[PDB]
Design a protein around this ligand. Structure first.
Ligand code: HDE
Ligand code: HDE
Ligand code: HDE
Ligand SMILES: [S]
Ligand SMILES: [S]
Ligand SMILES: [S]
Lengths: 726, 726, 308, 83
């Protein structure tokens, strides 16, 4: 039952591009990639080669193919303890999934700051550009379960655990700069509204159902994050190509005691990029694991995800200087008003070994701060601080979750807490209380100070009566949605209109659709009319006369809110499909692969069957996948080299591959006689921006394709796609 | 600094006698003691000295005396994460206790065999007299909760976890050679009957209630173990002075494949010794922790508990050679018929560091066997095999209970089981199933063989129909109870009669007492008449004429069943109370302590207050406890030195001390004017056997006292005690 | 039939003095004692007489004395689901005990006010002397486990669940009017110091050990409740003969919104009485269930615990 | 025991039998049924041994396994007839 003699079962322990080798556990694929946290898990990593198979109690098993029975056709005996241990462990493998963000994908890596930030914060991990902090990052969707799809329309989470020398700091962010609601008391209302409805548990991974739009129509505070979700922000191309945000105003506290308000940002060094809806939705069925898989392959290839941490900083005395409340998590701080200051770089460079042990059991929580940071009274953050510790008592089985290896600090931890289920740490301290004399009071409290100090909260003044009351300053709901809308490009605006139109078409009760369109009329009449037209709804004269909300502190727009208005393309780590034929022109393939290699763009070689085909010069080309097996949804562009085009000219899947890529606005390059495919997608002889064509694949041809890919999609083509039947 | 300047907060890290130092965690009290399992726990041991106090996330705490509030008289704020972590851990400290044997006390040690037993078993731990196997042993009662008292009347558990090189072997025994029931299906019935009754949850730690005796009266198979429980076996002096038994016939399997039937024994090398009932009951009140304390203090003093493992061996072809069924766990195998062959020695030499983490969380289970051992069809064992794995899923939170440090094998363990709550091990195997090619099928099965082989069950022949039926061969209930009774000394017999009588006096429904007396008449008429008399019950003519059960294989007694018929006393580790006065005769005290030291007998110096007193010759004597604080229940003998006897002669507590000790049959020694105390216990001028007396405390005075201590109690005193009001 | 001919297995369903009859479950001992809460529990009470023994899935058992085996001296078979269900349930009977107050004893009753308190509180259960509110009360020690002894020296808990028409109100009190510490953040320090010490888990049900007195000596805020615990308050004769206190200033709020500060008291109508130390300690060995027993038997005899 | 939290999962409403169920099992997490039986074991006299075993029979009888003959040695072996 064994391994093939050629060793082809085992992936090379070197960087390889996606598809070239089977994927593997990180410590086996990249054994020389280390950081302090990765090394500290060595106590619990378990190998396998050359070891005997045993029970969990260390007894070697002779026959792992049979139960013990009385005769070989007889009944199974209760004394078969080997069977019972094996099936007992299997019978209790599952733990509760996260209430929200159950679907997520994670990796190890490291962070360092560009310069010391000691003038603004005493946090140790931001104090020295050469002090490296390990991280573990989990990206996620929000609504769907652990087995739902990746490329749904949803908000994405972006949670980073920093293993700093002064404790764990978790920055528990999302990919939009605000949230749907203002006060954590309503969290279960909102989450229950977006989750599968309680009678039938439908729909999975989708806000396109009556209870979510009912809630939105009745809670206009949600409209800002709804605008982001209905935009292409809701359907990122990759976790490597979305922004991250900390969602709330926190504080930085320096050694002198000064508090500065801060909002956190992650900038993707691979640039901002998203899918289009039809593509995203069909990809949930063709590969529901697309983002998990693309993240893990990028790291195996060396395309390590990189992000730049950034801070918006607002002095304490400027708290009230905007036309929105800084503590309102439904409001963003426009970068035209407060720029993002670059802080440092995070690189994710190793996958886990065991998903369950490291990803499923990781626990992140925004109350895990360190000295040099603090909270504010944002009323959504305030409630979060309760939830993330509470929930782990069921999800991870008790209050020792910090002993599960991925969650352990690399900083020392010592205190008087004891016991609890599956307690690992064996305390030798004679004392389990303080103050004590019997252990001379150790471990001891530490005064606060400039470095290595105890935690003390900033002494914020509190003046007010005990009230359950929303601040009047939070009672504005339309200006930030309008600012977002006005900052999008015209194609982005169309995709927003199309997301609300598609979602509200799935709401069964028409009055809910009508009430949402009435909200949209309070944001922008052009948006509201365009959604209304798609729903067969006519705005009333009163709706037509609603006065638009005010500008936000004088801004008519802010281009940093758009995915695309300011070019930020990076093709490295992108992937092209190359459609083969049974006699490829090897000179074309050489030129294509050389130019892709030079820019770090990968290729997948596709055909109408698996196995190999041979080029004109005898080169044997292994086939990665069939046309149907790896659809155009999974790539950024498509190239069709010359050769025996007749082999694939009438293949329906090859033609459709080009029709789908064209509809989804992807660059297409056709060399030599592959130009015959121009007829399936109706390109005029003169050509069209977005379709690269030449007699051969050469310097010029590849440069044009790569320039297209740096612009991500061919937006100019949008008016041409309505008519394609694909 | 809160520790005192003279360092008297820290116990000496060397062997010290009971009461000389405060007790400490084992790795601090005896840092030099080691074994392979203690060494392997070092990775989870946590210190404390010189460390900062932190959260579990590694954040240093500045103020561990206050919650965070809005103003110093204000409300506590939800953002106080340090408070909520600390209280959340506290709030979840408790795990379910064990369904039975919840009260227990444990220590680390080691085992070695006297010679290789390879001719009868291939078990690795028994293959080489040089192979030392670490153990962890927990002793226990059965009925009461973890917070119940130690010196109750009950059966005692004796469970040994052997960390062998071929897996964990747990020997999960009790202190009697049989059990109350025959088939595991009745275990919940019997246990529910003995446990606190379900309306009101009374009584704790006692079988002296209606439902236990109802069950017994209706299930005569229980009478054998009930006889043991009603004897002084039910109230051992120490876990060091009781026997252990494995309860069932198991099998040894040698390398040739030969099966030999085996029952396991532990012989206490400190000898056999039990309390008397009034003393055991009163001690549950004066020190409900007395056995846990005596075990821990013995190990700290170097009086290490030692036991000799022994085997009764029966060839396969002798299965049916006895009057009873070897598979019937209500039958013993008399040592007169099958001698115990000595196998090896176990020494317990280190206390745990943290009771909850190593004691409460340890999981023992008799299915945990290794190659070279196997089961039989004993139908109580057979059902035990199901229970001990099952119960851990609630008690220890899931199927990873073998990853809790104390339960981890020291042998290698590798297999394809994954996940579960609390998963510590991070598996790097590319495969989680077999057969697999992608990891060359590792970890691999191992064929059985003479050493280091896989487990294979002995190929016992099974023949019969699928039945829920008791073997007719188990249907004899009275002969073994009668053999036990006839093997007891006359004073052991009196104490059996007094245990049934006291217990049945607590049964509220008189017909249950009558039904139990009827059962006793089937065992022995003298026993039944003596119990009936104490209950005011008269036997019928039919009861008087019940034929006694047959002898067991021609035996009418077996002296190995008695605690005391054959002297096996050992005084090392026993303790004497020395009653002081305000002017002790120093020469008496020097001779007493000199002789006690030479035999390794401890002493406690008692007085009417704490502090010190000064001897006649100026010597300062430090007081350990008051008369009331350390009652005679807690010692093995009492010595009163001469001196200013007037000081304590009219002290109620001092007189009562000697009356209590006298009643409980303990040796008492009086020197010089301490002979005045003879009047309080009604001793004649010519003296009596068991009371040592002389003008001074030497020549032969201490030899006489130590000879009385070697015989444990003064049984000839029994007729004199009913007159003393104590 | 295993019961005696003369019916003497079954206690009379009438009030009887301690020891006169075997004790019984309360709905069999006092079937006509009713309140809104006891009646609302009828949906889950299960009886037994004249019903067949079954699995939890409702299958009748023929032989509840044996496992299924291949031959009457054979191995037990894994297909014995009746055995496995019964032993599975037994194997999982225990739940974690309470972190503190694990040892306690409880009964049902009712509460009624002497007059309307509407001038000082709008709490519905205090609005009219006709308002009868069911209660369930649990008395407890603090330190010891659920199987520890009753007559230890300790503080006692006195917790009352009021089932009101406007919600559950729990008045969760003790038998002294103060506590050992000032701020909740030190609760785990104090409780760890009084509980059995962590190396060896001794002593059970006692403050008489080094870590408790080490904490007290270093935290003089504790001295007031330490005085109460060292007095005979710490060893009551009965849960019927000790005081209760709500420990804290709470507020009453009336219909007009006026707040009045309040501290709560329970006054035992059987009066105040305690043991002496030697008797209490010995009694933990002679009858560790003495207070649980005395409470149950008092209610069975009609000596109903009453508090104002 | 992990999925539904303990051994009282038959008391979760959808899983409850409509047939009567009565036995001596007690306690467990989430226990709903409040048993009034003075006995929680059998055989007992204090509740006249109820609830009682029921012999097998044509209708409303107790469960008894079919007395299939078993004959063989204790083996971990696949039957050749399965190969
Ligand atoms: C009051 C509003 C409120 C409340 C009560 C909660 N959430 Fe969360 N959220 C919880 C509660 C839970 C229940 O504790 C839970 C689920 C399981 C767990 O261990 O924690 C959790 C997960 C979570 C992750 C996954 C971390 C991971 O990969 O494991 C991320 C990225 C976010 N959240 C991000 C987030 C932001 C970005 C600003 C905002 C705003 C909010 N959320 C809102 C919020
Ligand atoms: C079918 C008959 C039957 C059944 C079903 C059981 N018992 Fe146990 N018994 C269990 C079931 C449980 C409930 O699984 C449990 C509860 C917690 C646990 O993990 O296992 C347990 C504990 C236990 C200990 C404590 C080990 C320790 O110190 O942690 C000891 C020494 C013994 N037993 C000894 C023992 C003997 C000596 C031969 C005989 C016979 C029996 N018992 C009878 C028996
Ligand atoms: C910060 C100060 C503090 C903190 C944190 C706690 N305690 Fe408690 N206490 C808890 C914590 C827990 C852990 O929640 C726990 C444990 C299990 C549970 O569910 O609640 C509990 C039980 C408890 C009972 C038994 C109720 C019953 O029969 O179940 C009674 C009568 C009292 N207490 C009385 C009490 C008073 C009267 C003034 C004062 C003051 C305090 N205590 C102080 C206190
Ligand atoms: S947020
Ligand atoms: S046994
Ligand atoms: S209190």
């Amino acid at each position: 039952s064994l391994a093939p003699e050629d060793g082809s079962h085992r992936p090379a322990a070197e960087p390889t591009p996606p598809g070239a080798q089977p994927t593997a556990p990180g410590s086996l694929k990249a054994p020389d990639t280390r950081n302090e946290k990765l090394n500290s898990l060595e106590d619990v990593r378990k190998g396998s080669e050359n070891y005997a198979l045993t029970t969990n109690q260390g007894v070697r098993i002779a026959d792992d193919q049979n139960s013990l029975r009385a005769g070989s056709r007889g009944p199974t005996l209760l004394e078969d303890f080997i069977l019972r241990e094996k099936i007992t462990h299997f019978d209790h493998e599952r733990i509760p999934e996260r209430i929200v963000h159950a679907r997520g994908s994670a990796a190890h890596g490291y962070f360092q700051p560009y310069k010391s930030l000691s003038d603004i914060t005493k946090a140790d991990f931001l104090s020295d550009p050469n002090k490296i902090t390990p991280v573990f990052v989990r990206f996620s969707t929000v609504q769907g379960g652990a087995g739902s799809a990746d490329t749904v329309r949803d908000i994405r989470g972006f949670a980073t655990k920093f293993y700093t020398e002064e404790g764990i700091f978790d920055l528990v962010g999302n990919n939009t700069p605000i949230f749907f609601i203002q006060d954590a008391h309503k969290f279960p209302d909102f989450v229950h509204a977006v989750k599968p409805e309680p009678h039938w548990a439908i729909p999975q991974g989708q806000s396109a159902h009556d209870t979510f739009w009912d809630y939105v129509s009745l809670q206009p505070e949600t409209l800002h994050n709804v605008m982001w979700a209905m935009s292409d922000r809701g359907i990122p191309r990759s976790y490597r190509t979305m922004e991250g945000f900390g969602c709330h105003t926190f504080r930085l506290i320096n050694a002198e005691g000064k508090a500065t308000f801060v909002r956190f940002h992650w900038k993707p060094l691979a640039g901002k990029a998203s899918l289009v809806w039809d593509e995203a939705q069909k990809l949930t069925g063709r590969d529901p694991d697309f983002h998990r898989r693309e993240l893990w392959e990028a790291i195996e290839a060396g395309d390590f995800p990189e992000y730049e941490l950034g801070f918006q900083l607002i002095p304490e005395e400027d708290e009230f200087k905007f036309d929105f409340d800084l503590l309102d998590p439904t409001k963003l701080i426009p970068e035209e008003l407060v720029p993002v200051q670059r802080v440092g770089k995070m690189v994710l460079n190793r996958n886990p070994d065991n998903f369950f042990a490291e990803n499923e059991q990781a626990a992140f929580h925004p109350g895990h701060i360190v000295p040099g940071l603090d909270f504010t009274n944002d009323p959504l953050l305030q409630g979060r601080l309760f939830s993330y510790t509470d929930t782990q008592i069921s999800r991870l089985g008790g209050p020792n979750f910090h002993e599960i290896p991925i969650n352990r600090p690399t900083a020392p931890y010592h205190n008087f807490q004891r016991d609890g289920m599956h307690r690992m740490g064996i305390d030798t301290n004679p004392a389990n209380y303080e103050p004590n004399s019997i252990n001379d009071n150790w471990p001891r409290e530490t005064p606060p100070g400039p470095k290595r100090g105890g935690f003390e909260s900033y002494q914020e003044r509190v003046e007010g009566n005990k009230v359950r009351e929303r601040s009047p300053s939070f009672g504005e709901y339309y200006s930030h949605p309008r600012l977002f809308w006005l900052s999008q490009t015209p194609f982005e605006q169309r995709h927003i209109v199309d997301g609300f139109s598609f979602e509200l078409s799935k709401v069964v009760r028409p009055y809910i659709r009508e009430r949402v369109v009435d909200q949209l009329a309070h944001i922008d009449l052009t948006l509201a009319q365009a959604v209304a037209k798609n729903l067969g709804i006519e705005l009333t004269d009163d709706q037509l006369n609603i006065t638009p909300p005010p500008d936000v502190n004088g801004l008519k727009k802010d281009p940093s809110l758009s995915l695309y208005a300011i070019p930020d393309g990076d093709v490295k780590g992108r992937v092209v499909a190359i459609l083969l034929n049974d006699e490829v022109r090897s000179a074309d393939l050489l030129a294509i692969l050389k130019a892709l290699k030079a820019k770090g763009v990968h290729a997948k070689l596709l055909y109408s069957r698996m196995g190999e085909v041979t080029a004109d010069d005898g080169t044997v080309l292994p086939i990665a996948a069939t046309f149907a097996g790896a659809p155009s949804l999974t790539v950024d562009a498509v190239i069709v080299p010359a050769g025996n085009i007749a082999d694939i000219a009438d293949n329906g899947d090859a033609n459709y591959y080009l029709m789908e890529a064209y509809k989804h606005l992807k660059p297409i390059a056709l060399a030599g006689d592959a130009r015959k495919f121009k007829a399936t997608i109706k390109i005029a002889d003169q050509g069209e921006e977005g379709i690269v064509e030449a007699d051969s694949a050469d310097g010029s041809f590849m440069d044009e394709l790569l320039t297209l890919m740096a612009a991500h999609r061919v937006w100019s083509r949008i008016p041409k796609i309505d008519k394609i039947p694909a």
